[PDB]
Amino acid sequence: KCPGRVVGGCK
Amino acid sequence: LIPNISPDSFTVAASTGMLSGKSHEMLYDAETGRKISQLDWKIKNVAILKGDISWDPYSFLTLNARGWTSLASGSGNMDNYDWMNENQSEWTDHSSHPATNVNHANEYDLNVKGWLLQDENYKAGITAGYQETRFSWTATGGSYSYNNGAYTGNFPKGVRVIGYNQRFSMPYIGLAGQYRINDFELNALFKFSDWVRAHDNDEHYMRDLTFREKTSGSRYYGTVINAGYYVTPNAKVFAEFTYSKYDEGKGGTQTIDAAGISNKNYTVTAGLQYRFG
Ligand SMILES: CCCCCCCCOCCOCCOCCOCCO
């Protein structure tokens, strides 16, 4: 889902 | 009636100088309004060329096309903050990208001025026009603090991280005044819109994501002031300062709400204006 952040992988 | 086509009804101007400013690419929770994401895009230094063509078809009416454009890539900056934790006010993530370029920028402004008051020294009128402004940045390299400082480090030098474009367009209304005493001339303009339409485009290269946002019905405020000296009856050397503020609007987000898109910018230029005839 990670909004905005340069890299994802928000778990 | 048939418009004035005399050469002296026509005036052109060009100036050069610098553009600077700051944009914001915003994201909010569409239920609480909580700010979850904020990217600040800086325009530090961009060389610009500014042009103006003005025609007086009638004594009371001036038609004007003006704009400016970046002469080359300029320097900028970007910071990317994210608030992933709804409980906590401080951001969870921050990246900083000093190696951000302003690829290009421009503005075009097509307008009419209806002159309602005039004497030998002073002319004043109401202006209305259509205006659009665009900026493009590429953020490369930089450093990061993620997951509350648990991960910190740098991105690889010169690798592009995020590509971002904004555009704002609007009809506007304004007041324009022109003062002339002997060879000195001052022009001042104040512009406003309550119906800006904004779009942006965001390429997150390390996530293979493209984001698109759009808002409408937001506000704009702008000023133009210039002062100069006639060195011939037809030629004026001048300096000009402008300021523009595109307020943040509230709109939708797309991935291939609630998003906010905003900008402020300044220009400082100097040049020459020439009236034909
Ligand atoms: C065009 C007749 C004026 C009617 C006033 C309505 C105001 C609405 O704003 C429209 C702005 O667009 C005007 C186009 O300006 C012409 C610029 O080019 C002329 C330079 O040669």
PDB file of N, CA and C in Angstrom, chain B residues 52-98:
ATOM      1  N   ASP B  52       6.402  38.566 -24.820  1.00  0.00           N
ATOM      2  CA  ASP B  52       5.119  39.264 -24.754  1.00  0.00           C
ATOM      3  C   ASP B  52       4.818  39.875 -26.104  1.00  0.00           C
ATOM      4  N   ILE B  53       3.589  39.657 -26.555  1.00  0.00           N
ATOM      5  CA  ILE B  53       3.088  40.294 -27.752  1.00  0.00           C
ATOM      6  C   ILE B  53       1.790  40.968 -27.377  1.00  0.00           C
ATOM      7  N   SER B  54       1.697  42.258 -27.671  1.00  0.00           N
ATOM      8  CA  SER B  54       0.513  43.007 -27.277  1.00  0.00           C
ATOM      9  C   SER B  54       0.012  43.837 -28.437  1.00  0.00           C
ATOM     10  N   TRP B  55      -1.304  43.809 -28.650  1.00  0.00           N
ATOM     11  CA  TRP B  55      -1.952  44.524 -29.744  1.00  0.00           C
ATOM     12  C   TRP B  55      -3.130  45.343 -29.216  1.00  0.00           C
ATOM     13  N   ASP B  56      -3.207  46.609 -29.625  1.00  0.00           N
ATOM     14  CA  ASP B  56      -4.341  47.464 -29.286  1.00  0.00           C
ATOM     15  C   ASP B  56      -5.268  47.621 -30.495  1.00  0.00           C
ATOM     16  N   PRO B  57      -6.151  46.644 -30.729  1.00  0.00           N
ATOM     17  CA  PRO B  57      -7.088  46.804 -31.852  1.00  0.00           C
ATOM     18  C   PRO B  57      -7.986  48.045 -31.692  1.00  0.00           C
ATOM     19  N   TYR B  58      -8.301  48.443 -30.461  1.00  0.00           N
ATOM     20  CA  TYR B  58      -9.112  49.646 -30.208  1.00  0.00           C
ATOM     21  C   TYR B  58      -8.495  50.413 -29.032  1.00  0.00           C
ATOM     22  N   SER B  59      -8.863  51.681 -28.875  1.00  0.00           N
ATOM     23  CA  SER B  59      -8.325  52.488 -27.771  1.00  0.00           C
ATOM     24  C   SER B  59      -8.613  51.864 -26.398  1.00  0.00           C
ATOM     25  N   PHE B  60      -9.730  51.160 -26.287  1.00  0.00           N
ATOM     26  CA  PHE B  60     -10.157  50.618 -24.995  1.00  0.00           C
ATOM     27  C   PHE B  60      -9.814  49.141 -24.809  1.00  0.00           C
ATOM     28  N   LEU B  61      -9.148  48.543 -25.791  1.00  0.00           N
ATOM     29  CA  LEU B  61      -8.980  47.092 -25.782  1.00  0.00           C
ATOM     30  C   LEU B  61      -7.585  46.683 -26.221  1.00  0.00           C
ATOM     31  N   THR B  62      -6.948  45.848 -25.414  1.00  0.00           N
ATOM     32  CA  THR B  62      -5.634  45.316 -25.729  1.00  0.00           C
ATOM     33  C   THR B  62      -5.721  43.802 -25.738  1.00  0.00           C
ATOM     34  N   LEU B  63      -5.138  43.166 -26.750  1.00  0.00           N
ATOM     35  CA  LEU B  63      -5.056  41.703 -26.752  1.00  0.00           C
ATOM     36  C   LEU B  63      -3.616  41.357 -26.485  1.00  0.00           C
ATOM     37  N   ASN B  64      -3.379  40.364 -25.629  1.00  0.00           N
ATOM     38  CA  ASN B  64      -2.016  40.084 -25.149  1.00  0.00           C
ATOM     39  C   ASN B  64      -1.732  38.587 -25.120  1.00  0.00           C
ATOM     40  N   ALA B  65      -0.601  38.171 -25.685  1.00  0.00           N
ATOM     41  CA  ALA B  65      -0.111  36.807 -25.495  1.00  0.00           C
ATOM     42  C   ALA B  65       1.254  36.860 -24.840  1.00  0.00           C
ATOM     43  N   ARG B  66       1.395  36.203 -23.697  1.00  0.00           N
ATOM     44  CA  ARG B  66       2.673  36.224 -23.002  1.00  0.00           C
ATOM     45  C   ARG B  66       2.971  34.883 -22.398  1.00  0.00           C
ATOM     46  N   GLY B  67       4.237  34.683 -22.066  1.00  0.00           N
ATOM     47  CA  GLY B  67       4.627  33.450 -21.436  1.00  0.00           C
ATOM     48  C   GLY B  67       6.098  33.432 -21.173  1.00  0.00           C
ATOM     49  N   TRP B  68       6.548  32.318 -20.616  1.00  0.00           N
ATOM     50  CA  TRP B  68       7.964  32.137 -20.437  1.00  0.00           C
ATOM     51  C   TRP B  68       8.288  30.671 -20.523  1.00  0.00           C
ATOM     52  N   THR B  69       9.569  30.388 -20.717  1.00  0.00           N
ATOM     53  CA  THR B  69      10.019  29.021 -20.829  1.00  0.00           C
ATOM     54  C   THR B  69      11.434  28.879 -20.282  1.00  0.00           C
ATOM     55  N   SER B  70      11.727  27.711 -19.725  1.00  0.00           N
ATOM     56  CA  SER B  70      13.051  27.409 -19.217  1.00  0.00           C
ATOM     57  C   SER B  70      13.999  27.340 -20.410  1.00  0.00           C
ATOM     58  N   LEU B  71      15.190  27.886 -20.248  1.00  0.00           N
ATOM     59  CA  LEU B  71      16.197  27.862 -21.299  1.00  0.00           C
ATOM     60  C   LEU B  71      17.010  26.570 -21.295  1.00  0.00           C
ATOM     61  N   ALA B  72      17.049  25.913 -20.138  1.00  0.00           N
ATOM     62  CA  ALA B  72      17.756  24.638 -19.976  1.00  0.00           C
ATOM     63  C   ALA B  72      17.311  24.026 -18.675  1.00  0.00           C
ATOM     64  N   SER B  73      17.736  22.791 -18.438  1.00  0.00           N
ATOM     65  CA  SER B  73      17.482  22.126 -17.176  1.00  0.00           C
ATOM     66  C   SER B  73      18.029  22.998 -16.043  1.00  0.00           C
ATOM     67  N   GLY B  74      17.314  23.060 -14.926  1.00  0.00           N
ATOM     68  CA  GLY B  74      17.724  23.882 -13.797  1.00  0.00           C
ATOM     69  C   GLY B  74      17.838  23.040 -12.544  1.00  0.00           C
ATOM     70  N   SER B  75      18.204  23.656 -11.427  1.00  0.00           N
ATOM     71  CA  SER B  75      18.431  22.879 -10.212  1.00  0.00           C
ATOM     72  C   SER B  75      17.200  22.899  -9.323  1.00  0.00           C
ATOM     73  N   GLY B  76      17.001  21.822  -8.573  1.00  0.00           N
ATOM     74  CA  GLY B  76      15.873  21.724  -7.677  1.00  0.00           C
ATOM     75  C   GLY B  76      16.200  20.833  -6.509  1.00  0.00           C
ATOM     76  N   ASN B  77      15.162  20.419  -5.796  1.00  0.00           N
ATOM     77  CA  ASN B  77      15.321  19.587  -4.610  1.00  0.00           C
ATOM     78  C   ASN B  77      13.994  18.882  -4.383  1.00  0.00           C
ATOM     79  N   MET B  78      14.014  17.717  -3.747  1.00  0.00           N
ATOM     80  CA  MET B  78      12.760  17.074  -3.376  1.00  0.00           C
ATOM     81  C   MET B  78      12.878  16.379  -2.036  1.00  0.00           C
ATOM     82  N   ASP B  79      11.827  16.490  -1.233  1.00  0.00           N
ATOM     83  CA  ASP B  79      11.744  15.733   0.003  1.00  0.00           C
ATOM     84  C   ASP B  79      10.426  15.018   0.059  1.00  0.00           C
ATOM     85  N   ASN B  80      10.479  13.770   0.511  1.00  0.00           N
ATOM     86  CA  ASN B  80       9.345  12.867   0.462  1.00  0.00           C
ATOM     87  C   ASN B  80       9.101  12.339   1.868  1.00  0.00           C
ATOM     88  N   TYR B  81       8.009  12.770   2.491  1.00  0.00           N
ATOM     89  CA  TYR B  81       7.660  12.351   3.844  1.00  0.00           C
ATOM     90  C   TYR B  81       6.359  11.527   3.811  1.00  0.00           C
ATOM     91  N   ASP B  82       6.309  10.445   4.576  1.00  0.00           N
ATOM     92  CA  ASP B  82       5.098   9.627   4.666  1.00  0.00           C
ATOM     93  C   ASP B  82       4.718   9.343   6.117  1.00  0.00           C
ATOM     94  N   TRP B  83       3.424   9.433   6.415  1.00  0.00           N
ATOM     95  CA  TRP B  83       2.873   9.183   7.742  1.00  0.00           C
ATOM     96  C   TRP B  83       2.074   7.863   7.723  1.00  0.00           C
ATOM     97  N   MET B  84       2.783   6.735   7.738  1.00  0.00           N
ATOM     98  CA  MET B  84       2.145   5.420   7.652  1.00  0.00           C
ATOM     99  C   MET B  84       1.386   5.009   8.917  1.00  0.00           C
ATOM    100  N   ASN B  85       1.796   5.565  10.051  1.00  0.00           N
ATOM    101  CA  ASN B  85       1.210   5.213  11.342  1.00  0.00           C
ATOM    102  C   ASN B  85       0.159   6.212  11.783  1.00  0.00           C
ATOM    103  N   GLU B  86      -1.106   5.821  11.652  1.00  0.00           N
ATOM    104  CA  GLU B  86      -2.236   6.695  11.949  1.00  0.00           C
ATOM    105  C   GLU B  86      -2.212   7.239  13.378  1.00  0.00           C
ATOM    106  N   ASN B  87      -1.576   6.508  14.286  1.00  0.00           N
ATOM    107  CA  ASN B  87      -1.512   6.934  15.677  1.00  0.00           C
ATOM    108  C   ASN B  87      -0.534   8.083  15.900  1.00  0.00           C
ATOM    109  N   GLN B  88       0.518   8.120  15.089  1.00  0.00           N
ATOM    110  CA  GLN B  88       1.653   9.003  15.343  1.00  0.00           C
ATOM    111  C   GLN B  88       1.712  10.197  14.383  1.00  0.00           C
ATOM    112  N   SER B  89       1.937  11.387  14.934  1.00  0.00           N
ATOM    113  CA  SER B  89       1.933  12.605  14.133  1.00  0.00           C
ATOM    114  C   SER B  89       3.222  12.796  13.337  1.00  0.00           C
ATOM    115  N   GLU B  90       4.354  12.439  13.932  1.00  0.00           N
ATOM    116  CA  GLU B  90       5.618  12.513  13.221  1.00  0.00           C
ATOM    117  C   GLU B  90       5.626  11.506  12.067  1.00  0.00           C
ATOM    118  N   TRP B  91       6.351  11.824  10.998  1.00  0.00           N
ATOM    119  CA  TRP B  91       6.405  10.945   9.835  1.00  0.00           C
ATOM    120  C   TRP B  91       7.175   9.662  10.121  1.00  0.00           C
ATOM    121  N   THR B  92       6.821   8.597   9.412  1.00  0.00           N
ATOM    122  CA  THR B  92       7.504   7.320   9.564  1.00  0.00           C
ATOM    123  C   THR B  92       8.644   7.206   8.566  1.00  0.00           C
ATOM    124  N   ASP B  93       8.524   7.934   7.461  1.00  0.00           N
ATOM    125  CA  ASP B  93       9.485   7.819   6.374  1.00  0.00           C
ATOM    126  C   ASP B  93       9.863   9.172   5.778  1.00  0.00           C
ATOM    127  N   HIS B  94      11.131   9.305   5.416  1.00  0.00           N
ATOM    128  CA  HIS B  94      11.626  10.524   4.801  1.00  0.00           C
ATOM    129  C   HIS B  94      12.774  10.192   3.872  1.00  0.00           C
ATOM    130  N   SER B  95      12.692  10.691   2.644  1.00  0.00           N
ATOM    131  CA  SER B  95      13.830  10.629   1.745  1.00  0.00           C
ATOM    132  C   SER B  95      14.129  12.028   1.257  1.00  0.00           C
ATOM    133  N   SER B  96      15.401  12.274   0.988  1.00  0.00           N
ATOM    134  CA  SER B  96      15.870  13.594   0.639  1.00  0.00           C
ATOM    135  C   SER B  96      16.687  13.473  -0.633  1.00  0.00           C
ATOM    136  N   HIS B  97      16.379  14.310  -1.622  1.00  0.00           N
ATOM    137  CA  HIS B  97      16.973  14.164  -2.942  1.00  0.00           C
ATOM    138  C   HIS B  97      17.476  15.491  -3.505  1.00  0.00           C
ATOM    139  N   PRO B  98      18.653  15.926  -3.041  1.00  0.00           N
ATOM    140  CA  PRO B  98      19.264  17.196  -3.446  1.00  0.00           C
ATOM    141  C   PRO B  98      19.573  17.191  -4.937  1.00  0.00           C
TER     142      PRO B  98
END
